[PDB]
């Protein structure tokens with residue numbers, strides 16, 4: 001396994017799912033019965049959107065979006081009145097990568113905050129995000145399609161599933177991406193829920209660097225069969241994203 005220093009840390013890239021990343025997600029409309037109110041707050045960007053946007057900022061690409069996207073929320077979502085249709089005019093976008101900064105600490109201009117919030121909202125719409133105080137998407141299968149069809153990435157983009165490969169062949173694909181300076185979108189599920197994140201480095205001892213999409217919290221080196229950040233879990237136990245894993249690889253511009 002070659003040593004590859006964290007590609008996202010090397011470029012300063014640290015996004016998360018709350019403000020000022022979520023300034024253009026839908027505003028929550030209803031209180032879910034039994035829950036405290038989030039009415040009038042913007043929804044979370046979604047882990048799937050935050051992982052994808054960090055990889056897109058690594059490339060500063062595309063300069064122009066390619067194709068619009070429209071979808072309708074599930075009628076089971078208790079945070080919105082129904083029907084609720086969402087639309088992003090991606091085909092008209094000119095993304096200014098000098099305003100979509102690598103990270104935000106609050107002192108940035110409204111233009112800079114809106115620029116990352118527009119990317120996040122466009123990416124989450126393109127993956128059919130189920131918006132809420134937490135926001136969820138199917139992930140990989142939607143991400144690979146959106147990067148090519150809506151954002152003009154190369155036909156090399158594709159999903160790979162962990163169950164289709166030996167451990168050696170799975171890690172060899174990850175290593176090859178990293179050797180080509182290509183961060184990898186990754187997700188999995190387990191006893192502290194499901195999450196999407198970015199693999200962007202390797203230490204030579206079969207651990208990989210992970211950026212979890214929480215602003216920096218828990219980022220570090222993990223085995224791909226023990227993707228277990230300590231920021232999650234209540235009560236003192238174990239858990240991580242070790243089941244039903246998939247990745248999107250080949251992520252580079254046309």
Ligand SMILES: *[C@@H](C(=O)O)[C@H](O)C(=O)N[C@@H](CC(C)C)C(=O)NCCCCNC(N)=[NH2+]
Pocket residue numbers: 046047048074128129130134135136137138139140187188189194195196
């Ligand atoms: C992850 C996060 O914000 O931490 C976020 O919960 C998420 O996207 N979870 C996914 C599963 C992971 C990507 C492994 C999820 O919600 N899966 C279920 C389907 C979600 C809703 N999608 C549609 N189209 N209704």
